[PDB]
Paper text:
Recently, a new class of glycosaminoglycan (GAG) lyases (GAGases) belonging to PL35 family has been discovered with an ultrabroad substrate spectrum that can degrade three types of uronic acid-containing GAGs (hyaluronic acid, chondroitin sulfate and heparan sulfate) or even alginate. In this study, crystal structures of two GAGases ([name] II and [name] [name]) were determined for the first time, and their catalytic mechanism was further elucidated through the site-directed mutagenesis of their crucial site residues and molecular docking. The structures of [name] II from [name] (GenBank accession number: SOD82962.1, 81.2% sequence identity with [name] I), [name] [name] from Bacteroides intestinalis (GenBank accession number: EDV05210.1, 44.8% sequence identity with [name] I) and selenomethionine (SeMet)-labeled [name] II (Se-[name] II) in their ligand-free states were solved at 1.9 Å, 2.4 Å, and 2.0 Å resolution, respectively. Both [name] II and [name] [name] are monomers consisting of two domains: an N-terminal (α/α)6 toroid domain and a C-terminal two-layered β-sheet domain. Notably, GAGases are more structurally similar to alginate lyases from PL15, PL17, and PL39 family than to various GAG lyases, which further structurally supports the speculation that GAGases originated from alginate lyases.
The N-terminal domain (Met34-Ala365) of [name] II is composed of 16 large or small α-helices (α1-α16) to form an (α/α)6 toroid domain. The C-terminal domain (Met366-Ser612) of [name] II is composed of 17 β-strands (β1-β17) to form a two-layered β-sheet domain with four small α-helices located between β5-β6 and β8-β9. Subsequently, there is an Ω-loop structure wrapping around a metal ion (Mn2+), which consists of three small α-helices and small β-strands, with many residues (such as His401, His403, Tyr427, Glu431, Trp438, Arg446, and so on) on top, which might serve as potential substrate-binding sites. Structurally, the Mn2+ is located inside the long Ω loop after the β1-β5 antiparallel β-sheet, and coordinates with the nearby nitrogen and oxygen atoms of several residues such as Asp and His in both [name] [name] and [name] II ([name] II also has coordination with three surrounding water molecules), with distances of 2.0–2.5 Å. Compared with structurally similar GAG/alginate lyases, the results from molecular docking and catalytic tunnel predictions showed that [name] II contains a shorter catalytic cavity, which may explain why they can accommodate and degrade a variety of substrates with very different structures.
Numbering used by the authors: 34 to 612
Amino acid sequence: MPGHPRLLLLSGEEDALKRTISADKTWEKLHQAIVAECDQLVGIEPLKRIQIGRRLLDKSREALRRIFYLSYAWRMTHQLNYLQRAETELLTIAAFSDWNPTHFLDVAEMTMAVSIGYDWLYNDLSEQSRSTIKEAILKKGIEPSMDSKYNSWLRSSNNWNQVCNAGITYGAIAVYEDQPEQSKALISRAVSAVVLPMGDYKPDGAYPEGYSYWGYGTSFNVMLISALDKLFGNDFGLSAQPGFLKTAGYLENMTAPSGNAYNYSDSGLSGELQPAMFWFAKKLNDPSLLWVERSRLMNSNPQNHLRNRLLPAALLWSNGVKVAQMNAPKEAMWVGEGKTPVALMRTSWTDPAAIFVGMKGGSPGTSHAHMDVGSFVMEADGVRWAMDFGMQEYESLESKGVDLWNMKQNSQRWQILRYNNFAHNTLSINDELQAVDGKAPLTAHSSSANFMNAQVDLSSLYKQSIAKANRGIAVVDKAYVVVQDEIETSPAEATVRWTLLTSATVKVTGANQAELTKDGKVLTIQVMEPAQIDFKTWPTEPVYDFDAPNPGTTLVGFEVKLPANTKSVIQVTLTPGSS
Ligand SMILES: [Ca+2]
Ligand SMILES: [Ca+2]
Ligand SMILES: [Ca+2]
Ligand SMILES: [Mn+2]
C-alpha cells in the first residue's frame, strides 16, 4: 500500500500533473485561479461550528473546499503559507465538539475534508498536529458511522449512501496505518453498500431524479472509485455496475444548445462545472464527453468555478485533455431507459441555432418527479419555445405546511401548479391528474438524420380514462418537430387536452395555427390532426397562495372530444421561422 499521500494523487504524481497543466492554456488558467484563491484564503478566518437549523452542512462543504484547495496548492507550489493555513483549518475543525452526526452528510463531507488534508499534508506536519487530526477523524468521523442511530444510509439507495460511504472511506484510508484491520473492514463495508444507489443507473445511465440531482451522489461515488483505483489498483468491480459509466453521456446530452438543461423533475436550468465528468472521460478515454464542460472552462468567469468544493479533482483527472482543440461529439442523439427514460435529440452540436428536443417517459411516483410523463422541451434558432417550469423552492413550501414530499395520488404535492400535468407539455384526459402508478416505457427510437424520433407508451398514465395512448416526437428533415399522439378510447368517450407551455408571445393566427414570437425569432404551431380544433390559452398565474408566480409564461393548446371505441390521432408541428 502507498504511504501518504495515498488518496487520489500519489507521492510524486504532482510533477507529471504540472507538465500537462503547463501545456494547456485552459487548464493553466484554472490552476492559477485556484492558487490565487488560496492566497485569499490565507487571510480568511477559520470556520466556526455554527449550524443553520439542523445542518452543519454549509460549514463541512466550505471546509472541503478550503482544505482541498489549499492542500492542492501546497503540493503544487510548496508555498509555506498554504501548508500553515490548511493546518490551522484542520486543527480548528478537529476541535469542534462534533461534526453533527444527526445530519450525517455533515460528518461525511467534514471527514472527507479533514482526511484529504491529513493525507496530503501528512509528511509535512508535526507529530502533534498529526495526532490531533487523526483522533478527530477517528472519533468524530469514523466512529459515529458505526453507530446504528447514525448509519441508516448504509441501507439507502439515494445520494446519502454514495456521499456517506465516500466520506467515511476517505477517513478509513487516511488513518489506515493506525487501524489496518478496521479500515479494511470499513472499505469493504462501503464497496458492498454503494452497489445499492448504483443500481439506479441501470441500464443506460439515465438519472432517475434528473439534472440537478445528478451531481451530488455521482461525484462522491466517483471520488470513492477513483481513490480505490489509485490505492489498490482496482475498484472491486464498482465502475462496471450496469449503466454507471454511461451516465457521463447522459449528463452531457442533458444540456440544450442554449446551455440550459432539460429541467424535468425537481431541477434547475443552469448547471456548473462538474469535475466528475473529467473522471468519466479519463476512465473511458473519451474526451468527447467533455464538450459542455469545455464551454464552461473556456467561457465562464473562473470565480464561478471557485465555489466548487471538488474543483482540484478536475485538474487531477485532466488526463492531458487539450480543451480548446477538442472535437465535438459525433452522436447528436442520446436515449436511455431505466426508471426515468429520456431521449435527447439535436440537429447539431456545433450550430447554436440547432433544433433540440428533450422528451421523457417514466412515472410521476419516482423520487423528485412531476406529472410530466410524455412531456418535452424544444429549442430552435437560439430560443426555448416549449419549456418546463422546473422546481419550486422547497423552503417556503415546507414552511407553509405543504405536503411536498408525499408522492401518492391524492397528495398535496400535485396541487402545486408547477408539478402537475396541466402545466407540462403532455396530455391531460378528462380533467384528471396523471396516474402516479403509471410508468411509460420508451418503446422505440431512431437517430435517422431526417427523422430522429422516440416513442413512449403513455397508456398506464391514463389507465382509467382511455384504452391506449402512445406518443412519438420527432425532428423531421432537420427542419421541424412533430408531436404525435395515438389514442384508443375505451367504450366511454374521453376529452383530451393538449398543452404547450411557453415564455414566447402567443398569437392565434388561424383556427389551427399559432405564432410564437421571442427574442426577434418566430415559431409556428400547426395542428394537423384533428382538422377541427378551438385553440385556447390557459393562465399560468397561481391557483393557491403557495404557488410561485410565473410571469411571462403562457399555456397554449386545445381540447378534443374523442368518441368511444375509436382510434384517433393528434398531430402538432412546431416549425421555426428559419424553416
Ligand atoms: Ca504517531
Ligand atoms: Ca436512487
Ligand atoms: Ca404569475
Ligand atoms: Mn416539471
